Amino acid sequence: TITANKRHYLEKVSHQGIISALAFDQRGALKQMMAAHQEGEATVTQIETLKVLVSEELTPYASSILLDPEYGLLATKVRANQTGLLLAYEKTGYDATTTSRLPDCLVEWSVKRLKAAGADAIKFLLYYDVDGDEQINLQKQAYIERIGSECTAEDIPFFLELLSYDERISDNNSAAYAKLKPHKVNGAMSVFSDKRFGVDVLKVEVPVNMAYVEGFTEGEVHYSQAEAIKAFQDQEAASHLPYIYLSAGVSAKLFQETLYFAAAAGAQFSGVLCGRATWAGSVPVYITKGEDEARKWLCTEGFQNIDELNRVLEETASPWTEKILEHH
């Protein structure tokens, strides 16, 4: 169930029950994107600045923005009036040499400090393999419980981001992984739907890899349209909690088509936390052509991406007001 104070915060990150939220808590991934356009490492100024620009120019078209508290704090100060704030709570990345991918909170933060920094919602990313080591998964469940309790005490929405994986498979983009994806994504959602975790909204992947779905590829087809529909219906049945889709690395167009497919399949998602699809193109422009030109790109191409996305959301998304349970 949802509390009155949590609901009131949830309304801040939404518009009319729909979360049309801009994702820009990327840290490692952004450093990589920037590195492919210049000689040196990305500086603190560069990361802080592009986040400021994206915040300034695109939050007028988003119901909320997700930012990291490491680099994105300047960007929290420059939001358009109606734009809610989500702050990431996890340390970025994982040790790829080991299999466990254990969760770890930013050492300088607590939910109380995140709330004090303006957060309307707490976000935490957990890598989860539902078929993985049981003691590792006990470890992960205890960790989420702690964070859920923090969010219960501070009476603020907890958004749990679930990234599925397999202990034995390095590459999430492989065909071998694609066959397993529905099981990993839906099984994880199902585990973290238990009241014990205090989750208010799930932020999840689409249950299939669209690159291997009939009608979306020139190559190997691992699911028919009907099979992909079934995987979305399974996602819909996997939880009772509201959920929003993360875009991962896909283009504005593929994501948009994914949302149409999702809605046609009967998936009832309350929004998206869309990142790279919207702002990826500003990275080359900012790094090579400077600050002023990046601003122009955001107000034209960047706006086009986000505005198209909002149009699709308006047609496809199901308000969380349909799903949320009141605490009276």
Next chain:
Amino acid sequence: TITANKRHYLEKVSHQGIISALAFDQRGALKQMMAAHQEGEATVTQIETLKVLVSEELTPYASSILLDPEYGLLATKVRANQTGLLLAYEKTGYDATTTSRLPDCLVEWSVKRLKAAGADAIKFLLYYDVDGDEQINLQKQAYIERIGSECTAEDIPFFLELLSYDERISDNNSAAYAKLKPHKVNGAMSVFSDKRFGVDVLKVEVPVNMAYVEGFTEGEVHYSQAEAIKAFQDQEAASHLPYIYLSAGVSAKLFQETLYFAAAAGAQFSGVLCGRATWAGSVPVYITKGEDEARKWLCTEGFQNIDELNRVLEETASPWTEKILEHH
């Protein structure tokens, strides 16, 4: 402010506003004491068994018992009727090669699970140098906030144990540390008295090293009685929260003499969490002579230790009902 549920739980670990608590969450320290009487590493069995025995025979004489959830789970089940339970939440010990001594929760636990395991109160041990690295202390402050928030959400008493230290001094027993103890202990208490930490009871050291106070030793003297009195008065001024004394490594006799001295000085402690002084002598008996002999020792020498302590407690301690602020 104390909540009605938190107070009800706190009553379970107390008798008439006084916490006469038996402390047996020792892990590393117990392994050390056992290794002094046999050849090898102490077995899991041995640690679990002695905890069961001390619990079985001495909890009839304590308002509560403190246990660790790593080895003490068997011992939780053998408590006398009136005896409440506190469970430790921290990983035992610390890396002695670095100065930071950063807090870290047992990876398999959350406050929720500690409650599920029967805890009436949650104890967490933090090493704190009030004069230490500011960013390290920020880390520690954030960390306690998380734990405090957990305990607020689960509506369960949070006992914060503060062990003071100096970043430059490894040995707490030394004369060099003795001169610094009052400032370290009282300063730490003062910091963690802020509402933001959600602490209900402070578990703290006596502010001086009694073994170096005039009148308590033949040998080196580092405080006059007038100076020891001042340290106890500063301790009483350091917080508004109820606090209880840990006995650390000191003998039953010196602990009792400390309590009388503390009360004379004006210290208003609400009880003790007393460990080694009470049961230490059962350790050689159990390892060398076995189960039955340890039991006879607990029912005789062990009872004597605790019964004398309780008598002194009755004369010296001030009930926490004199200090706690109700929520309405």
